[PDB]
Nucleic acid binder design. Sequence first.
RNA 1: CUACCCUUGGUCAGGUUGAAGUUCAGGCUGAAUGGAGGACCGAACCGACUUACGUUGAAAAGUGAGCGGAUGAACU
RNA 2: UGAGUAGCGAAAGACGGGUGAGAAUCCCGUCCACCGAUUGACUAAGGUUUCCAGAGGAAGGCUCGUCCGCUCUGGGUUAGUCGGGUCCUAAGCUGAGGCCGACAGGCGUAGGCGAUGGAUAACAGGUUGAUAUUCCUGUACCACCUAUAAUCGUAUCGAUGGGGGGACGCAGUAGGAUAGGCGAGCGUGCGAUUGGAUGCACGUCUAAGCAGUAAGGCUGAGUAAAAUCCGGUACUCGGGCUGAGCUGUGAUGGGAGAAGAAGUCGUUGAUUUCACACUGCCGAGAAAAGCCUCUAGAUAGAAUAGGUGCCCGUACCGCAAACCGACACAGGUAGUCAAGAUGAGAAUUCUAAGGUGAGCGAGCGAACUCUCGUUAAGGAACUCGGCAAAAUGACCCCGUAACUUCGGGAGAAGGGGUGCUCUUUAGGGUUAACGCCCAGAAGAGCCGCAGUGAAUAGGCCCAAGCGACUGUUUAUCAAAAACACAGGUCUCUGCUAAACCGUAAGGUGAUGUAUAGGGGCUGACGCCUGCCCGUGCUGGAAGGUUAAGAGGAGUGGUUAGGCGAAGCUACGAAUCGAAGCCCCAGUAAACGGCGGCCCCUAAGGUAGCGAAAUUCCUUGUCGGGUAAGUUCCGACCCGCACGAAAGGCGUAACGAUUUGGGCACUGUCUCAACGAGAGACUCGGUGAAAUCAUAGUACCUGUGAAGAUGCAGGUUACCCGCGACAGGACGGAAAGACCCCGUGGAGCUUUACUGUAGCCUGAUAUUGAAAUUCGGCUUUCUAACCCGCACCACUUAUCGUGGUGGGAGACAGUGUCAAGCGGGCAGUUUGA
RNA 3: GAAGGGCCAUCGCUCAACGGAUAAAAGCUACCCCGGGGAUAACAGGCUUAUCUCCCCCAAGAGUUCACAUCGACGGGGAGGUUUGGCACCUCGAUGUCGGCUCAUCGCAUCCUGGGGCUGUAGUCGGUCCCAAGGGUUGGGCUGUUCGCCCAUUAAAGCGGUA
Lengths: 44, 271
Amino acid sequence: VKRTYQPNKRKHSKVHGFRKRMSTKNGRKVLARRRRKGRKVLSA
Amino acid sequence: IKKYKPITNGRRNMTSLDFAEITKTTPEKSLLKPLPKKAGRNNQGKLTVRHHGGGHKRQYRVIDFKRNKDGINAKVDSIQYDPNRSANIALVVYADGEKRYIIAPKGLEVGQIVESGAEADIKVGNALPLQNIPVGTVVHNIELKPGKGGQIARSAGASAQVLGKEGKYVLIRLRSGEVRMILSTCRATIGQVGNLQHELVNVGKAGRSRWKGIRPTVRGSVMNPNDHPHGGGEGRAPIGRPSPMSPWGKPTLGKKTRRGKKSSDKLIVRG
RNA sequence: CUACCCUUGGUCAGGUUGAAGUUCAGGCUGAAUGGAGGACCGAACCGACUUACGUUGAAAAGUGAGCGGAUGAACU
RNA sequence: UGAGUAGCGAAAGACGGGUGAGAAUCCCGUCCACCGAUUGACUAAGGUUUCCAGAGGAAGGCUCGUCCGCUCUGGGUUAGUCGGGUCCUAAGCUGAGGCCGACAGGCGUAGGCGAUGGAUAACAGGUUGAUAUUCCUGUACCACCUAUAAUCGUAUCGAUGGGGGGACGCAGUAGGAUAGGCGAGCGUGCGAUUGGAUGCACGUCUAAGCAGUAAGGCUGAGUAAAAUCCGGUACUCGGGCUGAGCUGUGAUGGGAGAAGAAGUCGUUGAUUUCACACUGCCGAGAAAAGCCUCUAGAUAGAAUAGGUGCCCGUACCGCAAACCGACACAGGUAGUCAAGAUGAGAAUUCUAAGGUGAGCGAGCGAACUCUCGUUAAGGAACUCGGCAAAAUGACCCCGUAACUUCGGGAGAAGGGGUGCUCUUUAGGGUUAACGCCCAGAAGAGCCGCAGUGAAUAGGCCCAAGCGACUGUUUAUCAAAAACACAGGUCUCUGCUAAACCGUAAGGUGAUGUAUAGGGGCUGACGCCUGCCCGUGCUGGAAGGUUAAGAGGAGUGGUUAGGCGAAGCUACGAAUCGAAGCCCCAGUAAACGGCGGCCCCUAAGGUAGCGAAAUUCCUUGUCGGGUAAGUUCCGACCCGCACGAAAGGCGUAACGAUUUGGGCACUGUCUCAACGAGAGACUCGGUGAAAUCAUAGUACCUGUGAAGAUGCAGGUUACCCGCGACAGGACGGAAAGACCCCGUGGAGCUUUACUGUAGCCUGAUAUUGAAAUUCGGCUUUCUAACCCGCACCACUUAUCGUGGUGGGAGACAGUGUCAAGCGGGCAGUUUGA
RNA sequence: GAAGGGCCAUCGCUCAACGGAUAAAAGCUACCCCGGGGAUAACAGGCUUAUCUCCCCCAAGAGUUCACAUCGACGGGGAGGUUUGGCACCUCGAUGUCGGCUCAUCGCAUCCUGGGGCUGUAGUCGGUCCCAAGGGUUGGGCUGUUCGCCCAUUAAAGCGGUA
Ligand SMILES: [Mg+2]
Ligand SMILES: [Mg+2]
Ligand SMILES: [Mg+2]
Ligand SMILES: [Mg+2]
Ligand SMILES: [Mg+2]
Ligand SMILES: [Mg+2]
Ligand SMILES: [Mg+2]
Ligand SMILES: [Mg+2]
Ligand SMILES: [Mg+2]
Ligand SMILES: [Mg+2]
Ligand SMILES: [Mg+2]
Ligand SMILES: [Mg+2]
Ligand SMILES: [Mg+2]
Ligand SMILES: [Mg+2]
Ligand SMILES: [Mg+2]
Ligand SMILES: [Mg+2]
Ligand SMILES: [Mg+2]
Ligand SMILES: [Mg+2]
Ligand SMILES: [Mg+2]
Ligand SMILES: [Mg+2]
Ligand SMILES: [Mg+2]
Ligand SMILES: [Mg+2]
Ligand SMILES: [Mg+2]
Ligand SMILES: [Mg+2]
Ligand SMILES: [Mg+2]
Ligand SMILES: [Mg+2]
Ligand SMILES: [Mg+2]
Ligand SMILES: [Mg+2]
Ligand SMILES: [Mg+2]
Ligand SMILES: [Mg+2]
Ligand SMILES: [Mg+2]
Ligand SMILES: [Mn+2]
Ligand SMILES: [Mn+2]
Ligand SMILES: [Mn+2]
Ligand SMILES: [Mn+2]
Ligand SMILES: [Mn+2]
Ligand SMILES: [Mn+2]
Ligand SMILES: [Mn+2]
Ligand SMILES: [Mn+2]
Ligand SMILES: [Mn+2]
Ligand SMILES: [Mn+2]
Ligand SMILES: [Mn+2]
Ligand SMILES: [Mn+2]
Ligand SMILES: [Mn+2]
Ligand SMILES: [Mn+2]
Ligand SMILES: [Mn+2]
Ligand SMILES: [Mn+2]
Ligand SMILES: [Mn+2]
Ligand SMILES: [Mn+2]
Ligand SMILES: [Mn+2]
Ligand SMILES: [Mn+2]
Ligand SMILES: [Mn+2]
Ligand SMILES: [Mn+2]
Ligand SMILES: [Mn+2]
Ligand SMILES: [Mn+2]
Ligand SMILES: [Mn+2]
Ligand SMILES: [Mn+2]
Ligand SMILES: [Mn+2]
Ligand SMILES: [Mn+2]
Ligand SMILES: [Mn+2]
Ligand SMILES: [Mn+2]
Ligand SMILES: [Mn+2]
Ligand SMILES: [Mn+2]
Ligand SMILES: [Mn+2]
Ligand SMILES: [Mn+2]
Ligand SMILES: [Mn+2]
Ligand SMILES: [Mn+2]
Ligand SMILES: [Mn+2]
Ligand SMILES: [Mn+2]
Ligand SMILES: [Mn+2]
Ligand SMILES: [Mn+2]
Ligand SMILES: [Mn+2]
Ligand SMILES: [Mn+2]
Ligand SMILES: [Mn+2]
Ligand SMILES: [Mn+2]
Ligand SMILES: [Mn+2]
Ligand SMILES: [Mn+2]
Ligand SMILES: [Mn+2]
Ligand SMILES: [Mn+2]
Ligand SMILES: [Mn+2]
Ligand SMILES: [Mn+2]
Ligand SMILES: [Mn+2]
Ligand SMILES: [Mn+2]
Ligand SMILES: [Mn+2]
Ligand SMILES: [Mn+2]
Ligand SMILES: [Mn+2]
Ligand SMILES: [Mn+2]
Ligand SMILES: [Mn+2]
Ligand SMILES: [Mn+2]
Ligand SMILES: [Mn+2]
Ligand SMILES: [Mn+2]
Ligand SMILES: [Mn+2]
Ligand SMILES: [Mn+2]
Ligand SMILES: [Mn+2]
Ligand SMILES: [Mn+2]
Ligand SMILES: [Mn+2]
Ligand SMILES: [Mn+2]
Ligand SMILES: [Mn+2]
Ligand SMILES: [Mn+2]
Ligand SMILES: [Mn+2]
Ligand SMILES: [Mn+2]
Ligand SMILES: [Mn+2]
Ligand SMILES: [Mn+2]
Ligand SMILES: [Mn+2]
Ligand SMILES: [Mn+2]
Ligand SMILES: [Mn+2]
Ligand SMILES: [Mn+2]
Ligand SMILES: [Mn+2]
Ligand SMILES: [Mn+2]
Ligand SMILES: [Mn+2]
Ligand SMILES: [Mn+2]
Ligand SMILES: [Mn+2]
Ligand SMILES: [Mn+2]
Ligand SMILES: [Mn+2]
Ligand SMILES: [Mn+2]
Ligand SMILES: [Mn+2]
Ligand SMILES: [Mn+2]
Ligand SMILES: [Mn+2]
Ligand SMILES: [Mn+2]
Ligand SMILES: [Mn+2]
Ligand SMILES: [Mn+2]
Ligand SMILES: [Mn+2]
Ligand SMILES: [Mn+2]
Ligand SMILES: [Mn+2]
Ligand SMILES: [Mn+2]
Ligand SMILES: [Mn+2]
Ligand SMILES: [Mn+2]
Ligand SMILES: [Mn+2]
Ligand SMILES: [Mn+2]
Ligand SMILES: [Mn+2]
Ligand SMILES: [Mn+2]
Ligand SMILES: [Mn+2]
Ligand SMILES: [Mn+2]
Ligand SMILES: [Mn+2]
Ligand SMILES: [Mn+2]
Ligand SMILES: [Mn+2]
Ligand SMILES: [Mn+2]
Ligand SMILES: [Mn+2]
Ligand SMILES: [Mn+2]
Ligand SMILES: [Mn+2]
Ligand SMILES: [Mn+2]
Ligand SMILES: [Mn+2]
Ligand SMILES: [Mn+2]
Ligand SMILES: [Mn+2]
């Protein structure tokens, strides 16, 4: 069957990317709390 | 009107227009056509008021709505059809050599160098303000303001004979039957417009209506109460509440929607 | 993923029926031309009517056999 | 523990020879089988080293392992011209200034970013253990630069700027080529099975650059939207411009077969490829650059042989063991190529190219279960029901009913033909009438049980209900009678329209304008659509009733001098005070309306249908069909409780709809039988799970929390497995979904309560001048204010911002306060 | 001083769900959800036996005559545990539900067959009671049906228990 998640590089780095992240105030809030957590993976 | 024989059902009573007057030039002028991207929803993306969408690509042929030229005479070289304006247009060929798009009034002719200016030939055609022109003359594209080019009458039929004149603002009857005093000294093109046969068209086949901008519209009596005042009820059921209603509450088979304390209140009587 | 939707692309073996119009013979019938249609039969493709199997499954919705649509409100 | 139990994930393998400590499982081999519109070839998405070589075998691989998409070591991806960037734009995203906003921020003019589309300069061959339009052999183009000029001169380059291209939809017909297909000089070979001198393969050569090309489309000089010789527009004067499939030449040596240590012909068929070309239709079919131009402005001068040309991607999987599905998973995944025989075909069967033998096996040939095949006589008797299965099937020929909206119904129903050989000789095309295609017609034979001899390919008819139809739906228990539908009608909406998003700006509607646009109801079509003005709606407003606010009589407290003036202080009705509401009318395709005898409300069902999807009594009554018929059909009418836009009644066509009756068929059935395979079963390998208080776990009558393996009393029974069956363990699985309960939750309703978003109206600021009846009502004028219009600028921009001209004007709009409307939305109550 | 309180006297409640939740309050859920209950209903079991089925006692009458061949009014006494109920005792951390199919097993209040008494038994048939449970006890039409009607057979087309 078709399942949830059909991978897409561009679509993934849009919506989820560091750029899209910093684009919004809240995305900054996100990056903030991920760095506060000490995540290595941060936000691909 | 073409009247199709039932080759098949649904075609069972089609009546596509008898396009005899479409005559000259299928293609229409390249200069006058820009892009016409379509959308059923408003910005924000949310679907503001739409029981429609979909449908075929449309031209965006540009009407020369203003009739803003003075003293020149024009060829009226072609009778080419327009989708969005319902009534097909005619193409005036101005003496300057620039060409322009007129709406195409009943009567119609392959060549008549009428109008476009303050000089007043009251014999069909265009031009002529409100201060000029005889009482009772049939007239197409009326203006609502000076210089704005007009917008009142148009459509597939057209009317509104100059019902009297007086004051700083001459009175006129309208196709709705409202009799409004539009301001004097505003342009008003002579004659009725377009396909008197247009109202007689019957789509017949379902979804030829979807070839147009129209798309299907579910009733209020069906659906569910979270979705509509009429919604719900086990089995087919009547209206229920007194006064039939629209989605979003608000009664919809009696109450008048016209705005209170309008600026338009001074002009017009009856309708 | 799913529902509508905007922008831009792609796909639909084959067989059948013969609309208007046109072309000749009468005071709207036969023939040729012509090629209409959410038209017919049926693959691709899309779909899920019935049934059997499967039910700690190959599979957290499937498989076999038939079945519906298939130039369109088409499929993607 | 269950248990050495279930399972080991769709298929055809056999042997020989290797290797090795060890092979059913790795490698080589021969034969075999499987796919072949795909299990082949090529590529996008995604994956990122899985790609190659040599080594290795712990663990991963559902067995094994010498092997591997596993482990170690080493190594792999080469571009001026392929995809992308240094080109172009669409949706959309971002958006200097700007308009809005409690903040955060939202919107948006520029202008940018953005391919899935537009423009863009090379091809053939060879080669590696892994790359190649990328390396190299050959041949070639594009752009730039530097060196020459035959030819100009205060010819050449021309723009962010117009013009012309680019530039377009869907269907259908032929026709022109071309690929590929098929048969008869070229290499080899000539048979040990009775026979013969024919048996088998192949028959090609690229861009670039010379030549032409009828398939295609279209006529030439003078003058006049902001700067033009180009565009446009109009008056005179009778075959060549633009494209272009393909072919011919040259590229010309490269490609090539068999093996034994050099070949390019002819003939025939012919597209899905080469045109949105042509033709027809209406639902009237993107942009911007590259390109051709012409001006505004720039500038000394613009074939030949050397050179210069960047960044990114390039491995490998890619209908799959490398992608999404936790798995080496019977599923999902866009596009391109796609040969022979047979065919109408990409259908069907067998095969090419080319790929695979599916990561547990050996035996046996029990029950039972599954997937197949056959079946005496009967033929729906089975069953809730013909569920399932059987039957029909292709082409050529005849022949086809009620009805009807005249199209249909229709492939109705149904009948005949079909193989092979040999004669005759009449259409087609292609051609120098040779032969090559395709393919009929008549006649005589021959063979079988059977000739579309396999495979693949409609069962059909009668009648009823619902729904006109194609279409849509509950992803994952409902595909319908539900939704939609064209048509009908009602209502609102005069254009910053309503109506919707948002606090707003901004925006849908709609570059739309009453033949349009929003909402309600009905649902093609045909014949029609009855009777009745509390609620709603619309209009009217004479009178009643009503808020803030205006207004101040008079009331009370204090003390200057019990009485008690001022002052400041608490509190105050008479009057003025809008919309609503009360009352009036009109309106039913607005909400919504049927009483009682042997009397009334506003009016008490016209047409049509009727025991219906509607009928309780009920299997109503009579008839039809049957041997028999609670179903079905036709009537009937005392219609428990049909009825005319919640439409009434018919209706051809249509339906994986619900129902009743037949023809034909048959393992559905009488009534079961045998056969093939998978699993079950024995053996070798591997090896789970739910569940489980400890267990040495019999029956009967009884007892008991009122149905006992375990209690009483009898009865019966040596200890331990294997194959089987399900009565019981109130068997396993889910803290019952019904029921009730909790001063539990949530969704939904309304004339439940309390509110609120919004909308209507009033006072008051913004808010001015001037005209009579006593500041109030009504009118006139502009300096406030308002423009979703005109030209003007910032400015090669519909935004704003200023201007000016118009328009509307103390109204509006906003702000504060007020009173009505208000299940649109919210929080809750609704006893025991 | 006052505005305000306190104290004493009193008035304003079908607060009537009357020890009075608030000044102020109705419904739907089959789209449903959670916490509980066998404290409590629907199934089956159990107790009960009004109802039910069966069996008697009395004997007025019926039956030309005769109550007792057969039938049996008014009344009376019981059995069985298949019916509808009553009770709420086991089960709500689940005791699966009508009919059919498949397979049966038991009771006897016997439908058939075997043996008998009476007879209003001439004979062949019958009626009714008694003994008797060995075996037997049909295919269809209609309805989901169990029931029931019908068609056609048959020696007969039994009635119940077994969740
Ligand atoms: Mg049509
Ligand atoms: Mg609708
Ligand atoms: Mg409903
Ligand atoms: Mg069909
Ligand atoms: Mg399996
Ligand atoms: Mg060895
Ligand atoms: Mg490039
Ligand atoms: Mg650079
Ligand atoms: Mg913008
Ligand atoms: Mg700010
Ligand atoms: Mg590959
Ligand atoms: Mg495998
Ligand atoms: Mg069989
Ligand atoms: Mg059914
Ligand atoms: Mg069959
Ligand atoms: Mg026919
Ligand atoms: Mg009828
Ligand atoms: Mg019926
Ligand atoms: Mg707009
Ligand atoms: Mg009916
Ligand atoms: Mg009934
Ligand atoms: Mg009704
Ligand atoms: Mg009817
Ligand atoms: Mg086996
Ligand atoms: Mg096996
Ligand atoms: Mg058992
Ligand atoms: Mg449920
Ligand atoms: Mg509530
Ligand atoms: Mg209690
Ligand atoms: Mg009992
Ligand atoms: Mg017995
Ligand atoms: Mn139409
Ligand atoms: Mn519904
Ligand atoms: Mn509602
Ligand atoms: Mn309702
Ligand atoms: Mn109802
Ligand atoms: Mn085709
Ligand atoms: Mn079709
Ligand atoms: Mn299925
Ligand atoms: Mn289904
Ligand atoms: Mn299938
Ligand atoms: Mn099909
Ligand atoms: Mn079909
Ligand atoms: Mn599409
Ligand atoms: Mn064993
Ligand atoms: Mn084993
Ligand atoms: Mn076991
Ligand atoms: Mn076993
Ligand atoms: Mn096994
Ligand atoms: Mn396997
Ligand atoms: Mn070993
Ligand atoms: Mn091999
Ligand atoms: Mn094969
Ligand atoms: Mn990739
Ligand atoms: Mn490898
Ligand atoms: Mn090993
Ligand atoms: Mn292993
Ligand atoms: Mn190179
Ligand atoms: Mn800014
Ligand atoms: Mn692209
Ligand atoms: Mn391109
Ligand atoms: Mn490779
Ligand atoms: Mn190459
Ligand atoms: Mn068509
Ligand atoms: Mn030869
Ligand atoms: Mn030989
Ligand atoms: Mn021989
Ligand atoms: Mn590659
Ligand atoms: Mn797979
Ligand atoms: Mn697909
Ligand atoms: Mn594909
Ligand atoms: Mn083929
Ligand atoms: Mn062929
Ligand atoms: Mn095939
Ligand atoms: Mn091969
Ligand atoms: Mn067997
Ligand atoms: Mn079993
Ligand atoms: Mn099984
Ligand atoms: Mn057979
Ligand atoms: Mn048989
Ligand atoms: Mn037979
Ligand atoms: Mn028969
Ligand atoms: Mn027979
Ligand atoms: Mn039957
Ligand atoms: Mn039966
Ligand atoms: Mn039925
Ligand atoms: Mn069937
Ligand atoms: Mn036939
Ligand atoms: Mn014959
Ligand atoms: Mn014969
Ligand atoms: Mn339908
Ligand atoms: Mn359908
Ligand atoms: Mn679907
Ligand atoms: Mn479903
Ligand atoms: Mn606005
Ligand atoms: Mn309806
Ligand atoms: Mn007052
Ligand atoms: Mn005083
Ligand atoms: Mn009516
Ligand atoms: Mn009535
Ligand atoms: Mn029957
Ligand atoms: Mn009858
Ligand atoms: Mn009837
Ligand atoms: Mn009505
Ligand atoms: Mn209807
Ligand atoms: Mn029959
Ligand atoms: Mn077998
Ligand atoms: Mn365990
Ligand atoms: Mn324990
Ligand atoms: Mn024992
Ligand atoms: Mn005890
Ligand atoms: Mn007891
Ligand atoms: Mn007991
Ligand atoms: Mn016991
Ligand atoms: Mn055992
Ligand atoms: Mn059990
Ligand atoms: Mn519970
Ligand atoms: Mn109840
Ligand atoms: Mn509750
Ligand atoms: Mn109301
Ligand atoms: Mn005011
Ligand atoms: Mn301005
Ligand atoms: Mn208010
Ligand atoms: Mn209110
Ligand atoms: Mn509420
Ligand atoms: Mn609360
Ligand atoms: Mn209670
Ligand atoms: Mn006091
Ligand atoms: Mn009390
Ligand atoms: Mn209370
Ligand atoms: Mn329902
Ligand atoms: Mn619960
Ligand atoms: Mn208890
Ligand atoms: Mn009970
Ligand atoms: Mn029990
Ligand atoms: Mn008793
Ligand atoms: Mn008694
Ligand atoms: Mn209890
Ligand atoms: Mn008690
Ligand atoms: Mn339990
Ligand atoms: Mn249980
Ligand atoms: Mn006895
Ligand atoms: Mn017996
Ligand atoms: Mn029994």
